[PDB]
Ligand binder design. Structure first.
Ligand SMILES: Nc1nc2c(ncn2[C@@H]2O[C@H](COP(=O)(O)OP(=O)(O)OP(=O)(O)O)[C@@H](O)[C@H]2O)c(=O)[nH]1
Ligand SMILES: Nc1nc2c(ncn2[C@@H]2O[C@H](COP(=O)(O)OP(=O)(O)OP(=O)(O)O)[C@@H](O)[C@H]2O)c(=O)[nH]1
Ligand SMILES: Nc1ncnc2c1ncn2[C@@H]1O[C@H](COP(=O)(O)OP(=O)(O)OP(=O)(O)O)[C@@H](O)[C@H]1O
Ligand SMILES: Nc1ncnc2c1ncn2[C@@H]1O[C@H](COP(=O)(O)OP(=O)(O)OP(=O)(O)O)[C@@H](O)[C@H]1O
Ligand SMILES: [Zn+2]
Ligand SMILES: [Zn+2]
Lengths: 468, 611, 191, 470
């Protein structure tokens, strides 16, 4: 039972993809020169793993999904599709066209039932149906067993999970990006394996980051300003860029999905929940959450992340709109590169010397002409940032050995705090953070109103008017 | 010679270019070395010479020679540039090249062990010789009257196409003064320059005639180059190299002359008054030189038969100065087309060689070593055609090829003191400035054709001169059948096993360390031991460069983890026991100036003095 | 656009000397010239001329910039529509865009446009001579990806323009890939 | 043959084979778990225990998961209260597995187990030959063998006494090594199993295996207020096995470092011994036998045998912006230690020690084909290990330069002695370590902390799941 992915036949991502999914066999086949091929291959394989694991006799809920891709499926799906984005009208029209086109040919996947169910919702846009729905995750009144989240970042996590629990849901899944960089409160970052860059609005006019744009006509002295800012701190608004597509996000909702190991939900009913990580590959993670009634045990409120490759965060100096400032960035480093620099970092190294060594290790390494490092292991536009971080890290490690202190005592003059400019997490290392583990806020965001327009209803009904 | 000579000068350089500071191999780019153009200045010499007279302790003289030699170098460039006006060209854009680097080697600690009394060291060495070599230790009973004994008996020779004057064949000995040796090894003295010795040296008969440049000769050469390019080279450089020729350029001459030393520059300057043009210099006329040193190997063979006499065929002095600027480019191009697992000793040092084979040779591994010295290259004319075909593919400019070809045909030699004329046919060994390069090319071609595809799939192969070593190859009947097309003794092959039968390469041993676990190369102790029993000519003051060479070689011998391996390697090669004591004896000799004086004795004078 | 032999320039700099679309003549130098009007301003205007190999096409800036649409925008008049914009094919200058419209108003707009660079994009300021007078202005071009990757090593120090030119010429004939050596096969125009 | 979920070309296979020379081990990977190495050892341990036990006796299980004991040919009495936040999930899984296989498998009394579960759900306070809902103290069942698998939350002398009065004579214990906690260390690691543990007070460190910090500019002077002036280990420790977090206590961990011989005195008297039978890079298997009556005499000593290198050193780090010092422990492979004897004969700077260690880790010792030049040890403990050797060599030189007379001690009519410095403890392979502990216990507690165990909403779900049994 082979699985076909839409990527090139000589891409270096095959080795990483196969290692993350050892229960399958991956075969490449390219039909489209998409700019985000890596990001779609992972999602395709993730769904396949989830489907075979669960009982094929249960009911599955989808939150903010596209019903078009759930047509040729042997399971039972309840799609929750509100109208709160500019992409929803296009998806709904495509679903209707595909249903009518494939009517009478594939009479095995319950096509007639889906066609009839869609028509009923169009006539009365307030009914609850086994296949289709038009409310939100809170207002929906359908009972099932499994809930699935796919690339959802616009819903508060403790609130959504509680509303699913009271309807008899005992299992959940979540697929998306890693939320670790947002816990360190960084200004900009990158995911080089998937061609993704993100930044804050206050640094959108930088010069040497992955997502910016500056000007050339300049060279003057003196810019009068009314307000005295003096402050650079991250704000709520964050912009994402995957390939050539833009997505706005918010920090508060992103940090709500960094759940602890054990937490309690209290209200009219009580539940105990656990979170676990199953698959991790260079930025995407798959999390499984289980719910159970009652109260059991005690919580501690700690989150643990395991690093398979190097994670780096440093401080850089750049010019924003012509003014020199400083802020922090983060990125990921391959494990092989980190291991081979152990001996060099034993002493103090000049940043320009480190840059030359990194270039040779990356694209000028050979062993027998068979494997090597595929002559491109780390993308070349992040080397100057990495070289700066290693130089600062080595310098700060030498000062520690020159300030040897006594055992079990501390000195107060009333104590001095040193300066830190680099945080470096080597492979096979874990990081721990403190979060909240007790939730009891039963907010009721219940203001229900439909978002279906008369012209859109006419178009959908007309596409289904003809049975062929 | 190659690694190091007796005076520690060698043929290899001493600058590392194949070293990296990382635990993995890294490919890099080959760059060029800029040379300082010499300049002329006469006013400085005049004032410095006058300032030399008024006061000169030690450094004042040195400034005069530096100024004087610098003036000579500029004059040579000006005169040499004018001669080759029809062949001079300019600089064209160059073709970039790349090379592989290796990490630094690791060595074990060394501990010095030596005796105290220098006379006891001589007794131990003499005892070692008598126990293992009985006949060699009893030869010397009187003085060195070898010259007289050679005169009493007549002259026997086997000549071909030679003329000489019988009235000048007389060999009465001249005065001979030397120092009596202490070691009882009977190493002979260099021969005297007489007509009898010249005829004895030229007792070689290689008269063989085949198809000069006909169809059968071309067919064999065409196959030979096909095997070389298919089993030992990659295909990424041939078409680019053919487009860009190699021509004589001012930068080639300027760089070459600047590298010469003091005395060499002065000798070349003395032959620039009547400067012949490049097209006027004959390329097939040679002179005969005799001044050499006899070569002796361990064993008992020089006490029963007289050794041969070595000769040198010297070409025209101007011929080797006009065209010697293209050797560097030829080396670079050859290294670019070879496979990564095939190596050549050109442009390396001692440290670079150790780093390459550091993690390839392990105990229980079969190594094939083969030499091609015992082969008559004058019988077949296809051996010269193959070299020219390889040279043409490398991108040599056409008129220059004609000058090179003229030296590989019919040549003549003359002995100035006696007016003796010799004529030879096709010859490969000579004194021209392409001898190692052509021999290396032929050595690789012969191995590639015989071994076929077994050369491509290998761990490490090294070729230099007439010696080669190939890893993981044994002797089968297929190579015997392939090589038996004409005869059977074309080449000599020897099978070696690491830690059981140590391989031999360029007068050394390849051993695997025990403490660290890496391969290394060391020298031959028995070859040195027989060499200390060589008489020293009176008036020689070169007894200080040899002590430093011995001191360096002794230290490498006493590394921990190599004492036991060295004992087994010598026994498996020469069947001799008890060499640790000899090494200890060598240690105390190379400890002080006075300790080195115990190897000599009183001066003996023969055939001199009318008293 | 080097890959398609296309050059474009502003109307005010058609008498330059060292650009892709210019033409000048030989002069001996006249110290001081009459000036009925005063300049001191040199900014791009609305007129742009295109040359696709051998054919001339005049263009306008305002109409050219109107097709760089954002991701999401609304068209509200007598009737209302909501529409998007995506890029499907891009190859060294040529792009294919897809736009889908739908009636009604949905979602929220942000007014941002994003371009993805698979090749190096450069914009520098150069000094030239326009009709015998020295001025300065900015130019832009595209660079192949292979050249940019191999250029990273030396850009960590200070390099003179002469040194950079020599290495670019040499790097235009040979590159290193997977521990081996081959020709570039993706050369850039010499001019 | 035994199949383990390990990568086919991993370095842990050779070490695992040497620890179990009576089996043949083959790899079969079906899951990319982050703690695969830790699971393989436990799987093999159970097989060894069941191979030397009479198949006629009954075995108790303290704190076990009933799901993994279903398809077995032995008799198990599972004791599992409801005190953890992951216990209800295990019970639901157990019910689902039993219902999903009611007539397909005829191994043993599958129907009997289903009937046993229903009886316990009807009335809670009941004893069943298959299931129970009491603790290790409140349970009342007769058996011969008891098994403790990864248990760190009970007192050892107290638990053993309560099992002995019920007729249990043999016991086993599988888990982590206890020696690092007997040296009173502040942090440590197990590099082979990807496990890191640290004290609660140093969770904001910078260069240890389990920490997290942030960037700061260097503000000099924040507060004086409370005078800490002291930094000593506390009773709260945190573990991290791959990606899972486990909080534990020091007192309970140190109570399992039993001596060779000790006595249990009370209403009834017993004599018993402890012995280690399997050891592999951190996991040990202990066998305990008990017998009635009082025999012999005790000495109160615990001995451990080192097959690898054990290192403990003093390091300087920055906790929350302030420089402090504490101790760190780790394990070193035997081959690395052997190849370092010659270098440590002199005084070597830390910079040199790092370079030789890196060269030995990649070029020497380790090689291969296709998968070439692997790493013998993890690279994130190299800086710490290198510094430890440097200090050890320095201390061994001062001992030879300052000699003393034979059989006498030098004092300073007031007399006192001076104490030297000690910054590194290094236990070479083929060496033993000895500790002094207590071997006489006569005080026990008998609480009654068992109110109800279960709840009503969970009980209804279990009954509904088992309702569709036919
Ligand atoms: N930050 C963020 N990423 C998303 C979101 N939706 C999808 N993605 C990711 O974008 C990646 C590329 O997919 P797209 O190019 O958007 O196309 P698609 O997901 O197949 O379908 P469309 O949503 O209609 O575009 C997906 O793999 C998602 O992981 C979102 O709402 N926010
Ligand atoms: N410190 C500590 N380690 C434990 C404990 N329980 C299990 N482990 C170890 O965790 C490792 C992996 O088991 P996990 O998968 O994380 O735990 P699980 O979800 O209950 O499933 P199992 O693998 O069957 O244990 C095991 O090898 C145990 O050695 C515990 O209570 N404390
Ligand atoms: N409360 C909700 N319940 C279910 N689906 C929701 C909910 N809120 C949003 N969605 C769906 O999530 C998808 C993302 O749309 P969203 O509301 O987040 O606005 P957007 O700006 O277009 O996307 P984003 O803010 O994530 O970049 C939509 O399809 C939307 O229907
Ligand atoms: N006295 C006991 N007898 C038998 N089992 C016990 C006892 N106490 C705890 N357990 C079992 O220990 C397991 C989990 O340990 P614990 O009860 O201490 O919860 P915890 O918070 O996860 O602590 P830890 O991480 O150290 O295991 C539970 O399955 C529980 O049944
Ligand atoms: Zn619904
Ligand atoms: Zn019980």
């Amino acid at each position: 039972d082979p699985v076909y992915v839409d990527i090139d036949a000589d891409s270096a991502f095959l080795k990483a993809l196969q290692r993350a999914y050892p229960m399958f066999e991956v075969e490449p086949r390219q039909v489209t020169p998409n700019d985000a091929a890596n990001a779609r291959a992972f999602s395709h394989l993730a769904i396949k793993l989830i489907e075979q694991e669960i009982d094929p006799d249960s009911t599955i809920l989808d939150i903010g999904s596209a019903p078009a891709r759930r047509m040729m499926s042997d399971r039972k799906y309840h799609c929750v599709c509100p109208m709160r984005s500019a992409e929803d009208p296009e998806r709904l029209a495509n679903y209707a066209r595909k249903l009518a086109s494939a009517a009478g040919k594939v009479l095995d996947r319950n096509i007639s039932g889906k066609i009839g169910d869609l028509q009923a919702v169009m006539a009365v846009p307030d009914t609850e149906t086994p296949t289709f729905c038009l409310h939100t995750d809170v207002s929906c009144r359908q009972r099932a067993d499994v809930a699935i989240y796919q690339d959802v970042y616009a819903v508060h996590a403790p609130t959504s999970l509680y509303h699913q629990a009271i309807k008899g849901v005992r299992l959940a899944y979540w697929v998306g990006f890693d939320t670790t960089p947002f816990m360190y409160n960084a200004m900009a970052g990158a995911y080089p394996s998937y061609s993704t860059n993100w930044a804050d609005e206050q640094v959108l006019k930088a010069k040497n980051i992955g997502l910016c744009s500056t000007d050339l006509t300049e060279g003057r002295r003196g810019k009068l300003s009314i307000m005295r800012g003096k402050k650079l701190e991250p704000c709520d608004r964050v912009l994402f860029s995957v390939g050539s597509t833009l997505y706005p996000e918010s920090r508060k909702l992103l940090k709500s999905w960094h759940l602890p190991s054990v937490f309690h939900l209290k209200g009219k009913l009580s539940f105990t929940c656990r979170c676990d990580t199953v698959v991790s590959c260079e930025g995407y993670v798959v999390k499984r959450i289980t719910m159970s009634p009652g109260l059991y045990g005690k919580t501690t409120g700690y989150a643990v992340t395991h690093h398979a490759d190097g994670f780096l965060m440093c401080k850089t100096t750049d010019t924003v709109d012509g003014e020199r400032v400083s802020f922090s960035v983060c990125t990921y480093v391959p494990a092989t590169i980190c291991d081979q620099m152990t001996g060099i970092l034993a002493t103090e190294v000049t940043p320009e010397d480190a840059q030359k060594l990194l270039v040779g290790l990356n694209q000028r390494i050979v062993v027998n002409g068979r494997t090597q490092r595929n002559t491109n292991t780390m993308k070349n536009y992040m080397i100057p940032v990495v070289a700066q971080a290693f130089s600062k890290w080595a310098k700060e490690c030498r000062k520690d050995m020159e300030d040897e202190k006594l055992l079990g005592v501390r000195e107060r003059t009333a104590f001095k705090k040193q300066k830190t400019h680099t945080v470096y997490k080597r492979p096979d290392t874990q990081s721990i953070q403190k979060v909240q583990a007790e939730f009891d806020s039963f907010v009721v965001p219940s203001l229900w109103s439909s978002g279906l327009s008369i012209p859109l209803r006419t178009r959908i009904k007309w596409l289904l008017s003809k049975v062929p | 010679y190659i690694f190091s000579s007796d005076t520690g000068q060698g043929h290899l350089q001493q600058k590392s270019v194949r070293q990296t500071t990382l635990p993995v191999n890294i490919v890099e780019e080959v760059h060029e070395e800029k040379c300082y153009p010499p300049k002329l200045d006469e006013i400085k010499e005049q004032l410095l010479l006058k300032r030399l007279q008024e006061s000169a302790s030690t450094a004042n003289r040195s400034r005069y020679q530096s100024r004087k030699v610098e003036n000579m170098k500029a004059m040579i460039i000006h005169r040499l540039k004018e001669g080759c006006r029809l062949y001079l060209a300019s600089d064209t854009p160059r073709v970039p090249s790349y090379r592989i680097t290796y990490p630094a080697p690791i060595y074990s600690p060394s501990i010095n062990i030596k005796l105290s009394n220098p006379e006891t060291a001589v007794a131990v060495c003499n005892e070692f010789l008598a126990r293992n070599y009985p006949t060699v230790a009893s030869y010397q009973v009187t003085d060195e009257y070898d010259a007289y004994l050679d005169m009493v008996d007549g002259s026997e020779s086997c000549l071909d196409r030679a003329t000489f004057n019988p009235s000048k064949l007389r060999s009465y000995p001249k005065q001979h003064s030397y120092h009596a040796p202490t070691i009882r090894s009977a190493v002979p003295s260099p021969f005297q320059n007489t007509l009898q010795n010249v005829l004895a040296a030229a007792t070689k008969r290689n008269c063989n005639v085949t198809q000069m440049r006909e169809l059968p000769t071309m067919d064999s050469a065409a196959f030979n180059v096909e095997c070389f390019k298919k089993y030992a080279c990659n295909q990424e450089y041939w078409r680019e190299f053919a487009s860009s020729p190699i021509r004589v350029t001012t930068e080639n001459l300027t760089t070459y002359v600047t590298k010469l030393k003091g005395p060499k520059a002065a000798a070349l300057f003395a032959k620039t008054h009547n400067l012949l043009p490049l097209q006027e210099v004959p390329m097939d006329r040679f002179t005969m030189d005799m001044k050499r040193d006899v070569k002796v190997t361990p064993g008992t063979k020089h006490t029963e038969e007289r050794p041969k006499v070595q000769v040198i065929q010297a070409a025209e002095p101007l011929a080797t100065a006009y065209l010697c600027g293209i050797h560097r480019e030829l080396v670079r191009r050859l290294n670019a087309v070879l496979l990564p697992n095939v190596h050549t000793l050109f442009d390396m040092s001692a440290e670079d060689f150790d780093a390459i084979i550091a993690t390839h040779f392990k105990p229980g591994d079969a190594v094939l070593e083969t030499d091609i010295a015992s082969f008559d290259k004058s019988q077949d004319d296809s051996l010269a055609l193959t070299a020219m075909m390889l040279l043409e593919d490398l991108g040599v400019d056409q008129p220059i090829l004609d000058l090179i070809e003229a030296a590989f045909g019919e040549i003549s030699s003359c002995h100035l003191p006696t007016g003796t004329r010799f004529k030879f046919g096709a010859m490969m060994k000579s004194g021209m400035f392409l001898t190692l390069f052509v021999n290396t090319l032929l050595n690789i071609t012969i191995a590639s054709r015989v071994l076929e595809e077994r050369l491509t799939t290998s761990a490490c192969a090294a070729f230099i001169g007439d010696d080669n070593i190939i890893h993981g190859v044994v002797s089968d009947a297929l190579m015997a059948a392939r090589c038996a097309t004409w005869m059977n003794m074309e080449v000599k092959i020897i099978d070696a096993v690491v830690s059981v039968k140590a391989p031999y390469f360029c007068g050394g041993f390849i051993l695997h360390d025990t403490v660290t676990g890496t391969a290394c190369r060391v020298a031959d102790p028995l070859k040195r031991l027989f060499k200390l029993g060589k008489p020293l000519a009176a008036g020689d003051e070169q007894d200080e460069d040899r002590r430093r060479a011995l001191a360096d070689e002794v230290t490498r011998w006493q590394r921990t983890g190599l004492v036991t391996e060295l004992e087994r390697a010598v026994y498996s090669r020469y069947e001799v026991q008890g060499i640790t004591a000899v090494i200890t004896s060598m240690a105390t000799f190379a400890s002080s100036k006075e300790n080195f004086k115990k190897l000599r004795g009183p001066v003996v004078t023969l055939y001199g003095g009318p008293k």
